[PDB]
Design a protein around this ligand. Structure first.
Ligand code: HEM
Ligand SMILES: C[C@]12CC[C@H](OS(=O)(=O)O)CC1=CC[C@@H]1[C@@H]2CC[C@]2(C)C(=O)CC[C@@H]12
Ligand SMILES: C[C@]12CC[C@H](OS(=O)(=O)O)CC1=CC[C@@H]1[C@@H]2CC[C@]2(C)C(=O)CC[C@@H]12
Length: 473
């Protein structure tokens, strides 16, 4: 079994590194997905193939092929992400459901993710900006370098947990709160657990374990959150009077009243899957991107200044940020967009080939995972002049046509792209405005001079990011 599918690419004429029995190329990943992909591209070129366990993955880099995979042949061939072992009911989570199941869950969640529903929700999020400034002021007034991830992670979990589960929390000033402890326990599951790496090697074990309700997610944590959420929904029915606008409230409203009577409404179970998956998807991505943004700003003090000026122009005298004012921070959007070009935390987009296909003159067999190396295409001199430089003007209104949405894909693209993109961008800007309104960041002795990535599911750093924050007056 261990060296079965390993002659697949060589029969297809596709270059790639030579796999090992059982593990495929998995070991060569431990240097970092961003590095491995880069190396393969310079060596094998336009297209290469690799093996993760027994799973063949065909990395492609032509935008025309990428566009075909992510948009046109999305519903028909390239609809699903890889499985990663025995889930349980989490099969209903939007990012794990497949095919039609997925197409319905996405359709049901789309109303809950409208921009107008996002604008309604911002004022509940603002309060967690109050807390970020507190947490940061306490660390900074000590004249002791700040660990970005300490406070931004606190902000990330604070927002995403609160709004997904309907309860306010403060993971830093109240970690005893069972929701903080339990959610942290949940967010410790990650695709690089040994149990997953072993299921990746022997995928045929999954059916059996799902026959035995042996799931890859924490059994007990999820039983807690589920009951804790149940009580919320019910203690929420009795208090008619109050109008909630968090993610929980919009998904309950969607349960009653069927718009688009094509689909049956969400069950209570499917609804838990969404709230849990929102956190997995929102927590660490946001925490990382905010950290990388502050870092870029610290090592580019003139950019930091332009951001601060625009903030002060659009929000005079530390005016509180709102949905409609965040929407005016044109230069801040460019800063964010440029930080995601250098630091696409996902690193890769992945899609499963449902059937034999030929796309843009290339045959792809059923069962292969088409992989788009977003990190590679983001740093490619072929599409980006001077690509390792932070230059937010790249994303100016004037260079809009110079930007291919199938090269730059920090939120993926197409029908299965990040459903929370707009939320993530608003939320990150609420944080950035509140922080930069009060503080400025500069390097310190500790700050790791050029930044160094580390192996992980997301883009992580070797050493944490330490900066000093100096109060503004
Ligand atoms: C900076 C923050 C974030 C980044 C960089 C990010 C990035 C991504 C990427 C690259 C994908 C894959 C898209 C594809 O394969 O084409 C994705 C999927 C997804 N994201 Fe995020 N994300 C962020 C925040 C969030 C937040 C806050 C939420 C929820 C509120 C969220 C919810 C989702 C969901 C549900 C999916 C799965 C979509 C599906 O399978 O239908 N993300 N995200
Ligand atoms: C996983 C392994 C051993 C490695 C074989 O790979 S192979 O190249 O020797 O065919 C495939 C394989 C198949 C079934 C697996 C076996 C390992 C022992 C297993 C898991 C049990 O207790 C019951 C099922 C057995
Ligand atoms: C894990 C599962 C079946 C699912 C049960 O969950 S439950 O909600 O039905 O109680 C818990 C559970 C308990 C004992 C577990 C069993 C799976 C099979 C196990 C692991 C063995 O070979 C010996 C111990 C057995």
């Amino acid at each position: 079994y261990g060296t079965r599918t390993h002659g697949l690419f060589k029969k297809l004429g596709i270059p790639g590194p030579t796999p090992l029995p059982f593990l495929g190329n998995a070991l060569s990943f431990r240097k970092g997905y961003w590095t491995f992909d880069m190396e393969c591209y310079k060596k094998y070129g336009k297209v290469w193939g690799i093996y993760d366990g027994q799973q063949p993955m065909l990395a492609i880099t032509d935008p025309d092929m990428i566009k075909t995979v992510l948009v046109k042949e999305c519903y028909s061939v390239f609809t699903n992400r890889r499985p990663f072992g025995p889930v349980g009911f989490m099969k209903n989570a939007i990012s794990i459901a497949e095919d039609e199941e997925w197409k319905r869950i996405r359709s049901l969640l789309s109303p809950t993710f409208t921009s107008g529903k996002l604008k309604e929700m911002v004022p509940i999020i603002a309060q967690y900006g109050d807390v970020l400034v507190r947490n940061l002021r306490r660390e900074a007034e000590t004249g002791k370098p700040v660990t970005l991830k300490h406070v931004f992670g606190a902000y990330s979990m604070d927002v995403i947990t609160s709004t997904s589960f309907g309860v306010s929390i403060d993971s830093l000033n109240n970690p005893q709160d069972p929701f903080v402890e339990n959610t942290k326990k949940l967010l410790r599951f990650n695709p690089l657990d040994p149990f997953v790496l072993s299921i990746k090697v022997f995928p045929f074990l999954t059916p059996i374990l799902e026959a035995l309700n042996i799931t890859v997610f924490p059994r007990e944590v999820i039983s807690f959150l589920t009951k804790s959420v149940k009580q919320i929904k019910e203690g929420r029915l009795k208090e008619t009077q109050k109008h909630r606008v968090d993610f929980l409230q919009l998904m309950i409203d969607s349960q009653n009243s069927k718009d688009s009577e094509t689909h049956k409404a969400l069950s209570d179970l499917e609804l838990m899957a969404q709230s849990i998956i929102f956190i997995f998807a929102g927590y660490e991505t946001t925490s990382s991107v905010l950290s990388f943004i502050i870092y870029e700003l610290a090592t580019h003090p003139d950019v930091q200044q332009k951001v601060q000026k625009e903030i002060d122009t659009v929000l005079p005298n530390k005016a509180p940020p709102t949905y409609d004012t965040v929407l005016q921070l044109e230069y801040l959007d460019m800063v964010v967009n440029e930080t995601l070009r250098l630091f696409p935390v996902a690193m890769r987009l992945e899609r499963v080939c449902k059937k034999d296909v030929e796309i843009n003159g290339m045959f792809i067999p059923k069962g292969v995972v088409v992989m788009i190396p977003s990190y590679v295409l983001h740093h490619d001199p072929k599409y980006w002049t001077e690509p390792e430089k932070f230059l937010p003007e790249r994303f100016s209104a004037a260079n809009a046509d110079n930007i291919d949405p199938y090269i730059y894909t920090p939120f993926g693209s197409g029908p299965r792209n990040c459903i929370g993109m707009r939320f993530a961008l608003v939320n990150m800007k609420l944080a950035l405005v509140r922080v930069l309104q009060n503080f400025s960041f500069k390097p310190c002795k500790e700050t790791q001079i050029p930044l160094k990535l580390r192996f992980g599911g997301l883009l992580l750093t070797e050493k944490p990011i330490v900066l000093k924050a100096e109060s503004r007056d």
